[PDB]
PDB file of all heavy atoms in Angstrom:
ATOM      1  N   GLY P   7     -19.948   6.417  32.622  1.00  0.00           N
ATOM      2  CA  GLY P   7     -20.391   5.529  33.740  1.00  0.00           C
ATOM      3  C   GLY P   7     -20.002   6.108  35.040  1.00  0.00           C
ATOM      4  O   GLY P   7     -20.332   5.451  36.101  1.00  0.00           O
ATOM      5  N   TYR P   8     -19.417   7.278  35.158  1.00  0.00           N
ATOM      6  CA  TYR P   8     -19.014   7.885  36.375  1.00  0.00           C
ATOM      7  C   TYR P   8     -20.221   8.589  37.049  1.00  0.00           C
ATOM      8  O   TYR P   8     -21.349   8.552  36.507  1.00  0.00           O
ATOM      9  CB  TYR P   8     -17.810   8.818  36.164  1.00  0.00           C
ATOM     10  CG  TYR P   8     -16.894   9.058  37.327  1.00  0.00           C
ATOM     11  CD1 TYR P   8     -16.224   8.018  37.907  1.00  0.00           C
ATOM     12  CD2 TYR P   8     -16.657  10.317  37.805  1.00  0.00           C
ATOM     13  CE1 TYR P   8     -15.341   8.249  38.954  1.00  0.00           C
ATOM     14  CE2 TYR P   8     -15.827  10.568  38.861  1.00  0.00           C
ATOM     15  CZ  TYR P   8     -15.160   9.499  39.489  1.00  0.00           C
ATOM     16  OH  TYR P   8     -14.317   9.727  40.525  1.00  0.00           O
ATOM     17  N   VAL P   9     -20.017   9.267  38.146  1.00  0.00           N
ATOM     18  CA  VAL P   9     -20.998  10.003  38.899  1.00  0.00           C
ATOM     19  C   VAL P   9     -20.939  11.515  38.547  1.00  0.00           C
ATOM     20  O   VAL P   9     -21.930  12.194  38.455  1.00  0.00           O
ATOM     21  CB  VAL P   9     -20.953   9.727  40.366  1.00  0.00           C
ATOM     22  CG1 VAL P   9     -20.974   8.229  40.672  1.00  0.00           C
ATOM     23  CG2 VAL P   9     -19.678  10.368  41.039  1.00  0.00           C
ATOM     24  N   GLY P  10     -19.706  11.941  38.386  1.00  0.00           N
ATOM     25  CA  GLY P  10     -19.364  13.367  38.069  1.00  0.00           C
ATOM     26  C   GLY P  10     -20.012  13.721  36.697  1.00  0.00           C
ATOM     27  O   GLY P  10     -20.624  12.936  36.051  1.00  0.00           O
ATOM     28  N   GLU P  11     -19.950  15.048  36.390  1.00  0.00           N
ATOM     29  CA  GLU P  11     -20.453  15.640  35.156  1.00  0.00           C
ATOM     30  C   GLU P  11     -20.222  14.758  33.970  1.00  0.00           C
ATOM     31  O   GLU P  11     -19.138  14.317  33.647  1.00  0.00           O
ATOM     32  CB  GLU P  11     -19.808  16.981  34.941  1.00  0.00           C
ATOM     33  CG  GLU P  11     -20.308  17.733  33.658  1.00  0.00           C
ATOM     34  CD  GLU P  11     -19.968  19.256  33.658  1.00  0.00           C
ATOM     35  OE1 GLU P  11     -19.956  19.852  34.764  1.00  0.00           O
ATOM     36  OE2 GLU P  11     -19.769  19.762  32.579  1.00  0.00           O
ATOM     37  N   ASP P  12     -21.304  14.525  33.250  1.00  0.00           N
ATOM     38  CA  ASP P  12     -21.342  13.700  32.079  1.00  0.00           C
ATOM     39  C   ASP P  12     -21.562  14.561  30.810  1.00  0.00           C
ATOM     40  O   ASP P  12     -21.897  15.735  30.878  1.00  0.00           O
ATOM     41  CB  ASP P  12     -22.517  12.674  32.160  1.00  0.00           C
ATOM     42  CG  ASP P  12     -22.297  11.758  33.341  1.00  0.00           C
ATOM     43  OD1 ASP P  12     -21.146  11.451  33.698  1.00  0.00           O
ATOM     44  OD2 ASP P  12     -23.341  11.297  33.912  1.00  0.00           O
ATOM     45  N   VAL P  13     -21.411  13.938  29.618  1.00  0.00           N
ATOM     46  CA  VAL P  13     -21.550  14.664  28.363  1.00  0.00           C
ATOM     47  C   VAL P  13     -23.019  14.985  28.213  1.00  0.00           C
ATOM     48  O   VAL P  13     -23.337  16.080  27.638  1.00  0.00           O
ATOM     49  CB  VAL P  13     -21.030  13.748  27.186  1.00  0.00           C
ATOM     50  CG1 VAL P  13     -19.522  13.460  27.409  1.00  0.00           C
ATOM     51  CG2 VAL P  13     -21.842  12.523  26.983  1.00  0.00           C
ATOM     52  N   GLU P  14     -23.926  14.140  28.594  1.00  0.00           N
ATOM     53  CA  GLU P  14     -25.324  14.402  28.520  1.00  0.00           C
ATOM     54  C   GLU P  14     -25.678  15.632  29.327  1.00  0.00           C
ATOM     55  O   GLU P  14     -26.677  16.329  29.050  1.00  0.00           O
ATOM     56  CB  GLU P  14     -26.164  13.186  29.047  1.00  0.00           C
ATOM     57  CG  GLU P  14     -27.646  13.297  28.708  1.00  0.00           C
ATOM     58  CD  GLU P  14     -28.396  12.040  29.136  1.00  0.00           C
ATOM     59  OE1 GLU P  14     -27.782  11.132  29.810  1.00  0.00           O
ATOM     60  OE2 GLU P  14     -29.621  11.986  28.890  1.00  0.00           O
ATOM     61  N   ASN P  15     -24.981  15.946  30.479  1.00  0.00           N
ATOM     62  CA  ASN P  15     -25.206  17.076  31.265  1.00  0.00           C
ATOM     63  C   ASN P  15     -25.122  18.352  30.463  1.00  0.00           C
ATOM     64  O   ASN P  15     -26.020  19.193  30.605  1.00  0.00           O
ATOM     65  CB  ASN P  15     -24.216  17.096  32.410  1.00  0.00           C
ATOM     66  CG  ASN P  15     -24.619  18.069  33.533  1.00  0.00           C
ATOM     67  OD1 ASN P  15     -25.644  18.734  33.450  1.00  0.00           O
ATOM     68  ND2 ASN P  15     -23.830  18.072  34.621  1.00  0.00           N
ATOM     69  N   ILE P  16     -24.065  18.506  29.661  1.00  0.00           N
ATOM     70  CA  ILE P  16     -23.969  19.703  28.843  1.00  0.00           C
ATOM     71  C   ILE P  16     -25.189  19.865  27.904  1.00  0.00           C
ATOM     72  O   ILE P  16     -25.600  20.962  27.619  1.00  0.00           O
ATOM     73  CB  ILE P  16     -22.599  19.698  28.105  1.00  0.00           C
ATOM     74  CG1 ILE P  16     -21.475  19.906  29.086  1.00  0.00           C
ATOM     75  CG2 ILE P  16     -22.542  20.753  26.965  1.00  0.00           C
ATOM     76  CD1 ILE P  16     -20.054  19.516  28.520  1.00  0.00           C
ATOM     77  N   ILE P  17     -25.620  18.738  27.298  1.00  0.00           N
ATOM     78  CA  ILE P  17     -26.766  18.773  26.412  1.00  0.00           C
ATOM     79  C   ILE P  17     -27.964  19.365  27.215  1.00  0.00           C
ATOM     80  O   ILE P  17     -28.748  20.112  26.577  1.00  0.00           O
ATOM     81  CB  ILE P  17     -27.071  17.358  25.897  1.00  0.00           C
ATOM     82  CG1 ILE P  17     -25.866  16.700  25.169  1.00  0.00           C
ATOM     83  CG2 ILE P  17     -28.276  17.340  25.018  1.00  0.00           C
ATOM     84  CD1 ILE P  17     -25.349  17.494  23.992  1.00  0.00           C
ATOM     85  N   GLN P  18     -28.080  19.100  28.443  1.00  0.00           N
ATOM     86  CA  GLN P  18     -29.117  19.620  29.265  1.00  0.00           C
ATOM     87  C   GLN P  18     -28.904  21.110  29.462  1.00  0.00           C
ATOM     88  O   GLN P  18     -29.883  21.903  29.359  1.00  0.00           O
ATOM     89  CB  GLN P  18     -29.183  18.881  30.563  1.00  0.00           C
ATOM     90  CG  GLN P  18     -30.460  19.003  31.370  1.00  0.00           C
ATOM     91  CD  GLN P  18     -30.626  20.329  32.117  1.00  0.00           C
ATOM     92  OE1 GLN P  18     -29.623  20.974  32.397  1.00  0.00           O
ATOM     93  NE2 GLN P  18     -31.845  20.689  32.449  1.00  0.00           N
ATOM     94  N   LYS P  19     -27.701  21.495  29.869  1.00  0.00           N
ATOM     95  CA  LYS P  19     -27.364  22.904  30.061  1.00  0.00           C
ATOM     96  C   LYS P  19     -27.832  23.754  28.883  1.00  0.00           C
ATOM     97  O   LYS P  19     -28.484  24.824  29.139  1.00  0.00           O
ATOM     98  CB  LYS P  19     -25.851  23.046  30.239  1.00  0.00           C
ATOM     99  CG  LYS P  19     -25.290  22.482  31.580  1.00  0.00           C
ATOM    100  CD  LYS P  19     -23.938  23.072  31.935  1.00  0.00           C
ATOM    101  CE  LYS P  19     -22.844  22.642  31.070  1.00  0.00           C
ATOM    102  NZ  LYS P  19     -21.510  23.221  31.351  1.00  0.00           N
ATOM    103  N   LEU P  20     -27.541  23.413  27.659  1.00  0.00           N
ATOM    104  CA  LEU P  20     -27.973  24.200  26.508  1.00  0.00           C
ATOM    105  C   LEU P  20     -29.440  24.066  26.299  1.00  0.00           C
ATOM    106  O   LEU P  20     -30.078  24.936  25.755  1.00  0.00           O
ATOM    107  CB  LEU P  20     -27.160  23.753  25.275  1.00  0.00           C
ATOM    108  CG  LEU P  20     -27.457  24.489  23.990  1.00  0.00           C
ATOM    109  CD1 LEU P  20     -26.954  25.949  24.004  1.00  0.00           C
ATOM    110  CD2 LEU P  20     -26.777  23.736  22.809  1.00  0.00           C
TER     111      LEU P  20
END
Side-chain angles (χ1 to χ4, degrees):
Chain P
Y8 208 59
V9 306
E11 180 163 328
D12 300 329
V13 302
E14 192 178 6
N15 195 357
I16 289 164
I17 304 304
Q18 200 279 340
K19 289 201 291 180
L20 181 68

